[PDB]
Amino acid sequence: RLPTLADNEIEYEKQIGKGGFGLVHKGRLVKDKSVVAIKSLILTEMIEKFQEFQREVFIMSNLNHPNIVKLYGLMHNPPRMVMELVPCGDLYHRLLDKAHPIKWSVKLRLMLDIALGIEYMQNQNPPIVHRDLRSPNILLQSLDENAPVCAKVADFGLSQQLGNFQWMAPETIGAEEYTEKADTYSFAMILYTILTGEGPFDEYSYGKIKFINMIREEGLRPTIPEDCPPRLRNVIELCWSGDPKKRPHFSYIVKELSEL
Numbered sequence: 001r002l003p004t005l006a007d008n009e010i011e012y013e014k015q016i017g018k019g020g021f022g023l024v025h026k027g028r029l030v031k032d033k034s035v036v037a038i039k040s041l042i043l044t045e046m047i048e049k050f051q052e053f054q055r056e057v058f059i060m061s062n063l064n065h066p067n068i069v070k071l072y073g074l075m076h077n078p079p080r081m082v083m084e085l086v087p088c089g090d091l092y093h094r095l096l097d098k099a100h101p102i103k104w105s106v107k108l109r110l111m112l113d114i115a116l117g118i119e120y121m122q123n124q125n126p127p128i129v130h131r132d133l134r135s136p137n138i139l140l141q142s143l144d145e146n147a148p149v150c151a152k153v154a155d156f157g158l159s160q161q162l163g164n165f166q167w168m169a170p171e172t173i174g175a176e177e178y179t180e181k182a183d184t185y186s187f188a189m190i191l192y193t194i195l196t197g198e199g200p201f202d203e204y205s206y207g208k209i210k211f212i213n214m215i216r217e218e219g220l221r222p223t224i225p226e227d228c229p230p231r232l233r234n235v236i237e238l239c240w241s242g243d244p245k246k247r248p249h250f251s252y253i254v255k256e257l258s259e260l
């Protein structure tokens with residue numbers, strides 16, 4: 001069910017950078033001069049990004065949400081994906097401009113959008129576990145509060161490997177197949193980052209072994225600010241609990257966020 005396009009159908013422009021497993025470029029459809037994005041594999045059995053390639057394609061193909069990144073077609077020599085280029089960037093970089101803070105109305109917009117996207121992912125039979133949810137993977141479409149969509153979820157090769165474990169739910173570390181509650185834990189981290197603008201767990205320096213243990217065994221988490229809404233705090237705290245069971249359904253998270 002997914003179109004194939006030929007090289008004569010798209011025009012390359014400039015290279016955006018690496019997303020997920022590949023290299024993203026900015027391009028346009030020749031028929032329409034509409035902008036598009038092309039994802040390709042970049043060159044010892046690590047070239048197992050190929051599965052990530054296929055995995056991303058399969059998953060993107062069957063999904064359709066405003067808050068989820070879309071796929072348009074495929075290209076073949078070399079194998080490539082033509083997908084949407086989100087215009088405004090990624091969340092990680094945006095949070096790096098401290099001089100210019102994101103507006104609360106907007107931060108709220110971003111949080112909801114992500115939840116709506118993730119809520120949708122988990123309503124699938126079977127559910128979709130992203131597994132690589134962190135700020136670099138949240139793409140921004142508009143930073144305007146009145147826009148239909150502000151944030152979109154991305155990077156669907158479902159692998160794990162700012163990316164090391166600050167973002168990972170505890171059962172997940174040093175494990176392979178990662179329920180959907182892992183994502184809930186990650187989402188909490190994302191909520192924490194949008195709110196604070198500071199990366200998760202950056203207030204601590206522990207060696208790797210100690211750090212895992214602190215998170216797994218002791219319960220260490222980031223410190224939420226005193227001036228954080230109780231409604232929001234409560235939500236974050238739940239999603240990031242040690243017991244995966246205590247983590248909420250996205251129905252709850254979304255509703256609560258809406259009241260904020």
Ligand SMILES: COc1cc(C(=O)N2CCC(N3CCN(C)CC3)CC2)ccc1Nc1ncc2c(n1)N(C)c1ccccc1C(=O)N2C
Nearest residue numbers: 017018019020024037083084085086087089090136154155
């Ligand atoms: C207008 O297009 C975008 C621009 C930017 C952007 O401004 N960046 C990102 C990387 C960039 N680097 C280049 C040089 N710099 C000195 C170091 C880092 C810095 C600033 C970021 C994202 C953009 N849009 C975009 N749309 C769809 C994506 C995707 N991104 N990427 C890169 C992905 C990123 C993560 C996960 C998935 C994707 C992806 O699949 N797509 C299709």
